């Protein structure tokens, strides 16, 4: 990231702190938890609303020392009143703005917000799980501010969880108790906390909605797939992602050794000795080097992250992923709760930045063999069957004689988001009670209100609705500003938070009290649908056939001779 966005972000960081001191009140309050009393504070928004803020509620023991890479344990309760008037630190990670490592291993907290601690009725509880490829992200209000949602009468909760190698290391040897998915296990224990404690904050424990975007969406899906969380919540929203996205799991059991060696490990490749080194390494050295773990072959086969969710090698007490996600969908309790899913209109536009550094990537569309699903493609991507599959992809996205950046970014939308959604819907249909799934398509383009991810994708002055452009209309961030209430941006906040809260409440996203929705007939997807219908969200709201549907069926034809793997 540029020296200009660094000084610029530095200033907004200093502005956000003064604004945050400014928007604080003297009205502390205490609430009950099953671990003891917590002290919150009331806060202000740039729209002159106000909410109670409880930050830094621990939902697990700090996962330091001997707990590093291990499943989380419950935290130690306290007498007295714990201070929750400030945020704790985020998970150790690479700051995308600076490039430096920031954060702390003491990161397992959650934040609770609401405009009213004593509602006259129990409220819907919304749990947000942030994205960031499982390697970055946080529940800090400079990035995920509750200011828009607290206009509604809900209880909003933002959780953190272990990221990167600290969150997702995995070792084969059963004696060392590092099966993997530690970060996912964190989310589970947070969900357990939210179930037993939301009532103390005016929340309805029997009406809980979990949602997230990108990695947060995959997380949400995992929380819907695993037995560990059965009946913990009652609605799910999958925003630009799920667990069968190709970036949302990896077998990384061999990569611990590599990481060890990058960090200066001396010795042999056995798990025990690898583990002992990594257990005493400085946290910020491990995280800084994660970028270098993937081999060139792996990057070639489109493996995005060295460490992430994984099929655990053996089953222990807190096992989350005992089988590949496709297999888990077949028994998943989550198939039987109301579900919303969606994407933006130009997902792949996010990859503008990446292309700018590697223009050679565009030549991959000359045969597109690199984007053939890995389970179907061959090691070297050279088999005649793989060139065939690559050609089907190519027909779907290369518009002219030579591929362009736009073809590439268009392909990415499908590789990373639309094709996986399609595969999931069809799989879910064969294994479900018949609970509705609703689709949306976020198609609202604006440059007048933005979020920090746009700094990273280099989305400055770039038309089209990229992956993460929707977050801006859900959460406040330190780059936002008060918008006139009649502006198209303000209306979109209202609509977006309106639909999400309506869905959270009833398991049905339609409301006539939401402006723009008066002609809308939002029907769920049926198994007998050849064509998906989605609510398309732009300046106006309109039910349409998913425009990506033809290209989606094209990708599906790659599985003509391998229908069992679809």
């Amino acid at each position: 990231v540029s020296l200009m966005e660094k000084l610029k972000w530095k200033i907004k960081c200093i502005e956000n702190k003064f604004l945050n001191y400014r928007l604080t009140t003297n009205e502390t309050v205490v609430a009950e938890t099953e671990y003891g009393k917590v002290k919150g504070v009331k806060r202000l928004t740039v729209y002159d609303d106000s909410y109670y803020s409880f930050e830094g509620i621990p939902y697990a023991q700090p996962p330091v020392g001997e707990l590093r890479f291990k499943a989380p344990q419950r935290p130690t309760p306290w007498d007295g009143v714990r201070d929750c008037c400030n945020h704790k630190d985020k998970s150790v990670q690479v700051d995308f703005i600076t490039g430096k490592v920031c954060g702390s291993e003491d990161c397992l907290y959650l934040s609770v917000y609401t405009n009213n601690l004593n509602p006259e009725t129990k409220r819907p509880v919304l749990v947000y799980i942030h994205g960031g490829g499982f390697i970055i992200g946080e529940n800090h209000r400079d990035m995920y501010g509750p200011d828009y949602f607290i206009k509604k009468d809900v209880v909003l909760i933002n959780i953190q969880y272990r990221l990167g190698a600290l969150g997702f290391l995995s070792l084969n040897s059963e004696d060392l108790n590092v099966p993997g998915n530690a970060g996912l296990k964190d989310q589970v224990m947070a969900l357990r906390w939210i179930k037993n404690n939301c009532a103390n904050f005016g929340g309805n424990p029997d009406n809980i909605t979990v949602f997230g975007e990108s990695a947060g969406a995959a997380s949400t899906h995992y929380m819907m797939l695993t037995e560990q969380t059965r009946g913990l919540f009652h609605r799910g929203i999958l925003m630009s992602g799920n667990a069968i996205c190709p970036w949302a799991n990896t077998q990384c059991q061999h990569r611990a050794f590599t990481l060890a060696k990058l960090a200066g490990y001396k010795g042999e490749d056995n798990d025990k000795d690898v583990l002992e080194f990594l257990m005493k390494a400085k946290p910020q050295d491990l995280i800084k080097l994660e970028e270098k773990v993937l081999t060139l072959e792996e990057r070639t086969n489109k493996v995005m992250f060295p460490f992430g969710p994984t099929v655990e090698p053996y089953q222990t007490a807190d096992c989350v992923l005992p089988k590949h996600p496709r297999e888990m969908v077949k028994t998943a309790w989550g198939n039987s709760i109301p579900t919303m899913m969606g994407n933006t209109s130009y997902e792949g536009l996010f990859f503008t930045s990446i292309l700018k550094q590697m223009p050679l990537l565009v030549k991959e569309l000359e045969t597109c063999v690199n984007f053939v699903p890995s389970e179907l493609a061959d090691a070297e991507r050279t088999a005649p069957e793989t060139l065939e599959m690559g050609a089907k992809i190519k027909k779907a996205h290369v518009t002219g004689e030579t591929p362009t950046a736009d073809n590439f970014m268009d392909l990415c939308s499908h590789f990373y988001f639309w094709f996986p959604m399609h595969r999931l819907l069809q799989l879910r249909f064969n294994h479900t009670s018949g609970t509705p799934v609703y689709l949306y398509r976020f198609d609202f383009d604006s440059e007048d209100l933005i979020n920090p991810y746009r700094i990273m994708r280099s989305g400055r002055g770039v038309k089209g609705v990229s992956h993460t452009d929707e977050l801006t209309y859900f959460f406040w961030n330190q780059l936002a500003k008060r918008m006139p209430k009649e502006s198209r941006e303000y209306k979109t906040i209202e609509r977006m938070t309106g639909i999400w809260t309506q869905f959270a409440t009833t398991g049905n996203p339609y409301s006539n009290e939401i402006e723009g929705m008066e002609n809308v007939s939002w029907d769920p997807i049926e198994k007998s649908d050849e064509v998906y219908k989605c609510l398309n969200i732009s300046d106006e709201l309109k039910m349409i056939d998913v425009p990506e549907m033809g290209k989606i069926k094209q990708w599906e034809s790659m599985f003509e001779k391998h229908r069992d793997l679809f």
Side-chain angles (χ1 to χ4, degrees):
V1 150
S2 64
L3 212 61
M4 70 128 298
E5 300 285 12
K6 279 186 182 179
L7 169 67
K8 222 188 185 180
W9 177 264
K10 173 174 302 169
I11 287 173
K12 310 295 283 182
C13 280
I14 296 169
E15 289 182 20
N16 177 90
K17 197 213 68 64
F18 280 132
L19 185 62
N20 171 67
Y21 174 78
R22 285 180 45 82
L23 267 24
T24 328
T25 75
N26 297 323
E27 192 191 342
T28 67
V29 283
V30 181
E32 295 294 340
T33 76
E34 65 190 359
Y35 297 84
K37 307 181 161 67
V38 298
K39 174 165 74 52
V41 65
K42 173 85 118 303
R43 296 176 183 281
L44 310 168
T45 77
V46 299
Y47 295 90
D48 295 320
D49 297 308
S50 72
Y51 63 103
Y52 302 92
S53 170
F54 302 78
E55 301 180 279
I57 297 155
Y59 64 82
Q61 265 299 119
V64 290
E66 279 295 297
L67 302 183
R68 180 193 283 185
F69 303 129
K70 314 304 186 54
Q73 305 167 346
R74 297 161 80 84
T76 293
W78 57 87
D79 184 42
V81 193
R82 176 179 193 102
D83 187 310
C84 288
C85 293
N86 293 324
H87 64 69
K88 293 278 176 171
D89 214 347
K90 55 178 61 180
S91 178
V92 200
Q93 61 184 268
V94 188
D95 189 303
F96 59 103
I97 293 302
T98 91
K100 303 294 196 63
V101 185
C102 57
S104 149
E105 291 195 84
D106 190 350
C107 61
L108 298 204
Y109 304 88
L110 50 78
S111 297
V112 181
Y113 316 107
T114 184
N115 60 37
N116 197 343
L117 266 186
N118 311 95
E120 295 180 30
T121 62
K122 300 310 255 171
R123 292 182 168 189
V125 179
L126 284 65
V127 184
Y128 185 77
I129 307 176
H130 69 80
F134 305 99
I135 49 162
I136 63 175
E138 61 286 306
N139 68 3
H140 297 175
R141 291 180 291 102
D142 69 333
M143 185 51 157
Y144 299 99
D147 310 38
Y148 303 160
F149 267 112
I150 56 80
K151 296 180 159 301
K152 305 304 195 166
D153 295 347
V154 298
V155 174
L156 178 59
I157 296 163
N158 288 74
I159 74 172
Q160 280 188 163
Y161 56 92
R162 273 173 287 172
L163 299 175
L166 297 169
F168 295 91
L169 200 76
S170 176
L171 308 175
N172 288 319
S173 165
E174 189 168 338
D175 309 32
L176 309 155
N177 194 51
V178 184
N181 301 326
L184 287 179
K185 280 152 190 182
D186 292 333
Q187 301 175 0
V188 171
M189 187 161 299
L191 286 187
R192 276 166 197 161
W193 190 97
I194 288 170
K195 182 60 133 156
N196 300 334
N197 294 285
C198 60
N200 307 128
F201 300 83
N204 180 0
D206 289 318
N207 195 28
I208 297 166
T209 294
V210 189
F211 67 128
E213 184 269 341
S214 200
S219 302
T220 295
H221 194 204
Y222 282 124
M223 298 300 104
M224 293 164 84
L225 294 182
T226 184
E227 304 281 338
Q228 298 284 12
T229 54
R230 206 172 252 267
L232 245 34
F233 50 100
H234 316 84
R235 294 90 161 78
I237 312 174
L238 276 33
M239 313 171 57
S240 299
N242 64 73
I244 75 177
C245 290
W247 49 265
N249 60 82
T250 191
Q251 297 314 97
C252 52
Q253 284 72 36
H254 185 14
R255 295 177 192 134
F257 172 81
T258 301
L259 173 66
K261 300 293 294 198
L262 283 155
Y265 168 63
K266 270 74 156 330
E268 305 298 329
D269 182 16
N270 61 81
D271 294 348
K272 184 183 181 160
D273 294 341
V274 159
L275 182 50
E276 257 157 75
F277 184 78
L278 295 175
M279 286 280 285
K280 74 188 52 181
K282 297 180 188 58
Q284 62 275 15
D285 287 355
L286 295 196
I287 297 295
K288 181 219 284 267
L289 291 161
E290 273 190 53
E291 333 180 338
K292 291 175 175 279
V293 168
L294 289 174
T295 66
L296 186 45
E297 289 86 349
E298 283 163 328
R299 300 164 192 271
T300 292
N301 289 242
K302 307 297 173 180
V303 178
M304 185 169 287
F305 306 112
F307 299 97
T310 200
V311 177
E312 287 168 66
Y314 52 87
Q315 277 178 290
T316 49
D318 306 279
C319 183
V320 176
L321 311 188
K323 303 191 69 65
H324 281 96
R326 284 181 78 265
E327 301 295 312
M328 301 190 58
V329 170
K330 303 176 191 187
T331 48
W333 71 269
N335 297 351
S336 308
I337 66 187
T339 305
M340 186 158 65
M341 310 177 190
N343 292 287
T344 71
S345 65
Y346 204 163
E347 289 281 1
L349 193 53
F350 186 90
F351 295 91
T352 273
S353 174
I354 291 78
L355 278 192
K356 236 134 200 167
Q357 223 62 16
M358 307 199 56
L360 277 193
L361 279 171
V362 183
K363 297 289 290 305
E364 286 181 347
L365 271 59
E366 241 151 11
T367 62
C368 292
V369 294
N370 285 352
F371 290 104
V372 168
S374 59
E375 66 263 34
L376 291 181
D378 63 310
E380 282 191 323
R381 309 270 172 161
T382 57
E385 181 163 30
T386 298
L387 187 69
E388 288 178 25
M389 287 161 167
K392 289 178 173 177
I393 292 182
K394 181 177 192 206
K395 289 167 166 86
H397 300 288
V398 181
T399 51
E401 175 179 340
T402 292
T404 59
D406 258 23
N407 305 159
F408 182 90
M409 295 187 297
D410 186 40
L411 198 157
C412 288
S413 304
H414 285 83
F415 183 69
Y416 293 112
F417 299 110
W418 291 99
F419 190 51
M421 180 183 85
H422 174 53
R423 304 180 63 174
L424 171 67
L425 287 166
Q426 291 309 309
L427 190 59
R428 193 180 164 276
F429 278 141
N430 299 324
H431 299 292
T432 185
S433 53
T435 358
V437 43
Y438 300 87
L439 298 179
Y440 69 87
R441 188 171 184 270
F442 193 71
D443 191 16
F444 180 81
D445 194 356
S446 162
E447 191 100 36
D448 279 358
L449 195 62
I450 73 180
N451 80 63
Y453 277 109
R454 193 185 283 255
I455 312 296
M456 171 202 305
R457 71 188 173 95
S458 314
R460 297 285 205 178
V462 170
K463 286 265 145 301
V465 190
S466 155
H467 184 67
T468 73
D469 282 352
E470 82 268 48
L471 292 179
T472 311
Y473 307 97
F474 281 105
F475 306 102
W476 167 272
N477 72 82
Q478 63 168 32
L479 302 176
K481 57 176 203 151
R482 171 167 205 169
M483 300 299 303
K485 297 177 228 63
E486 232 58 63
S487 66
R488 54 190 299 262
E489 297 85 353
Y490 186 84
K491 280 174 187 174
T492 300
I493 299 177
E494 277 192 290
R495 288 162 157 165
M496 290 320 280
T497 54
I499 303 165
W500 262 231
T501 46
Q502 172 74 36
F503 183 73
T505 316
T506 77
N508 189 332
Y510 174 74
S511 165
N512 55 21
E513 297 195 312
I514 293 169
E515 184 249 321
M517 246 180 181
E518 299 76 23
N519 281 314
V520 169
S521 292
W522 205 342
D523 293 318
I525 310 294
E526 302 295 321
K527 185 188 188 158
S528 52
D529 295 344
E530 286 178 75
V531 185
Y532 299 141
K533 297 174 177 284
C534 65
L535 178 69
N536 188 88
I537 306 163
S538 190
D539 291 86
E540 63 172 43
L541 314 188
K542 197 190 155 184
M543 292 306 304
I544 65 176
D545 283 346
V546 171
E548 286 76 10
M549 198 74 196
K551 287 176 187 171
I552 281 181
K553 301 302 296 189
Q554 267 301 279
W555 284 67
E556 182 181 356
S557 69
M558 276 182 301
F559 296 80
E560 277 168 359
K561 301 189 259 258
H562 304 289
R563 290 294 307 175
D564 58 285
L565 304 182
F566 185 77

